[PDB]
Amino acid sequence: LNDNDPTFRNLPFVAEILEGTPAGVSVYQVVAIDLDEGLNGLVSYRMQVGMPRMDFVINSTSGVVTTTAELDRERIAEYQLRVVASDAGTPTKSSTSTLTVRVLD
Ligand SMILES: [Ca+2]
Hints:
Residues 9-105 form the Cadherin domain. Interacts with USH1C and USH1G. antiparallel heterodimer with PCDH15. Isoform C1: Interacts with CAMSAP3; leading to inhibit CAMSAP3 ability to induce microtubule bundle formation. The chain is mainly beta. It is 0% helix and 43% strand.
């Protein structure tokens, strides 16, 4: 059955990114691994907050994180992006860790 929750290999992480970094920049690629077999160890990625106006998206397959707007320290200085890594197990197992982004002046 579904023994193992996915385990993050590269979260938590604090990224510093220069303000003026435009929309459409892939800033990171999250990796979580699941020891379980087949469907029980196929990992998918989402943000914890379903909020549709975030300045970052994560691709559910690749775990690639991309800007959706120009970063501006005067607008948001720090993002704590909670990433959920889930397996496709019949009971779904998941882990959450934070990609923190600090916008440098
Ligand atoms: Ca699993």
